[PDB]
Amino acid sequence: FKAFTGEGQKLGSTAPQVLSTSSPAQQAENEAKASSSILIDESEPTTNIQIRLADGGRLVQKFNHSHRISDIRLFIVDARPAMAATSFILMTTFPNKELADESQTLKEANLLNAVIVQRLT
Amino acid sequence: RPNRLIVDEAINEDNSVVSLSQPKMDELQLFRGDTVLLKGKKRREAVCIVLSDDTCSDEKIRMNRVVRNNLRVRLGDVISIQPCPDVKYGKRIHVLPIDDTVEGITGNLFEVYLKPYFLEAYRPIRKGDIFLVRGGMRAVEFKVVETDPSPYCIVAPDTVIHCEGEPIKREDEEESLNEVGYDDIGGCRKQLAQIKEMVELPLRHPALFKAIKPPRGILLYGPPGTGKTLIARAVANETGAFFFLINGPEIMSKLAGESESNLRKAFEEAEKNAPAIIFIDELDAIAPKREKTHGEVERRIVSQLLTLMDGLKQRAHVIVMAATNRPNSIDPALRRFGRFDREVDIGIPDATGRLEILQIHTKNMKLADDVDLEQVANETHGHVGADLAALCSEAALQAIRKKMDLIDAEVMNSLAVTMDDFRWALSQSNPSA
């Protein structure tokens, strides 16, 4: 009853993962820079949204409500410039509704929580 | 302790969602869509995802049947929940089917059931978990034997899934999901809640009644086929109470003395398995009206039933329930205080009830986009749960017979029932009430 036998063809298509963005310590430094670049309103409450990446995320980041999804879309690229050349799409989970519109604020999108997972675009 | 929560039924039918109250979510610092490592009774661990629910008490945690069984936990128990951010995208995940449900079913159990269920949803998974996948008008179970990150894992579009066939046998500790559950009954939600409030505490916390009266007789009545037996079976299953079915015709078939002995031994056995539930099906068949009975042996058996039921008083934690059509259907002195002192009216399911029953019976069925159960449920006047099940089965049969003109699980899942099939079955409904 060996559990390592045979094979099953791939579930999906090829995923172009490179992770050529330097040692994760550099990623953390750039994430800190981007976080400091986030303008905290000081009035509306603050929430930490953690993000999952294909290779692995866990990128916890505090945020506000007045911002737009464009804010996170830009912050992710700042912390991961390699994503600048690689278009990214963010979707919630259960339902896995794709988050398309960016002009809507986080309050408008009522997404103040960790349903931020990255998929290839 | 904040992590301690009382299990409760889940409205969300998804197999991997745990509903919690928003106050409790924020108090626990749990963000919807995050993984959680539930701790069961016998060191059982279930990895699921938390979701907010306004209609949920803070201590109450709503769960699906599958997760409950995976944790070997029943409603009203206490479970520990904590975030488990340490989840990796496992690559090698080995899942196997269960023989008792895939027998006579051919075609690779992938691209048919496993593939659509997983796809890209990122369903969390733990080693040894059991989950149910619906398709091809059948509910196939699967056991997660191994995962690349031992033991917790989450499927990913880059995860490699191995399904090497060879269905595994069901171990006795595990309780098959084919058994009736609280979600298998629709329409009589009010009566079902009444039954919970009536019988849950004696069975779940017997020590309280032995120390600190309890209801001993519940008379379920209504048109035949309304699922009364279904109700009793479900109740027994969630409360973990021994179930003993005493079919009225079975007793009446036995000759004089043999029938009374059988009834007596059934009660004694049920008593020896306390806590237990005795379902006296078709009670009118055993104890009809005084005018209807015209035989010494029947009056003797009725007297014997009354004497045994009275003897139940010195016994305890044994609940006897029976099925009939109307209280006046059975002879008097059976509704006297004590014996069958409580009554419940299942009645006929309403439009919402019929919709719920149809959904329950069509879970495995693949219906076309044009098929809408609400419109038909509105049309289906005076149908009993048995009638609704038969109607759905007839529509399925119509679709299958139509396709035969042109078993492989792929072919089975390929065909889908259409609204025309439902309309045709409707024309052949033959209502019973």
Residue numbers in the entry:
A (entry chain B): 250 to 370
B (entry chain A): 22 to 233, 236 to 429, 437 to 463
Please, what does the article write about this entry?
The AAA+ ATPase valosin-containing protein (VCP)/p97, known as cdc48 in Saccharomyces cerevisiae, is an essential and highly conserved protein involved in numerous cellular functions, such as regulating protein homeostasis, endolysosomal trafficking, membrane remodeling, chromatin regulation, autophagy, Golgi formation, and others. Its core function is to unfold ubiquitylated proteins in an ATP dependent fashion. Previous studies have established that post-mitotic Golgi reassembly requires presence of VCP, as well as two adapter proteins, VCPIP138, and p4734,35. VCPIP1, also known as VCIP135, is part of the ovarian tumor protease (OTU) family of DUBs, an essential family of enzymes that remove ubiquitin tags from proteins to regulate protein homeostasis and function.
We find that there is clear density for three UBX domains, with two bound to N-domains in the up-position and one bound with N-domain in the down-conformation (see “Methods”). Although the UBX domains from VCPIP1 and p47 share structural homology, the p47 UBX domain has an additional helix (aa 273−286), which allowed us to assign all three visible UBX domains as originating from p47. Using AlphaFold354 predictions of VCP N and D1 domain bound to p47, we were able to fit in the highest ranked predicted model into our density (see “Methods”). Compared to the VCPIP1 UBX domain, the p47 UBX domain binds to a partially overlapping area of the VCP N-domain. It also uses a phenylalanine, F343, to occupy a hydrophobic pocket within the N-domain defined by VCP’s V38, A142, Y143, and R144. Additional interactions are mediated by V364 and V366 of p47 UBX domain that engage with F42 and Y143 of the VCP N-domain, respectively. The extra helix of the p47 UBX domain is connected to a short loop (aa 244−272) which is connected to the SEP domain (aa 180−243) through a long linker that includes the SHP box (aa 253−261), a motif previously reported as critical for VCP binding. The SHP box acts a secondary binding site for p47 UBX domain as it has residues that interact with the top of the VCP N-domain, unlike VCPIP1 UBX domain. Specifically, L260 of p47 further stabilizes P178 and L182 on the VCP N-domain, G255 and E256 interact with H183 on VCP and F253 SHP approaches R113 and E167. Lastly, there are additional contacts through A252 right next to the SHP motif, which interacts with E167 on VCP.
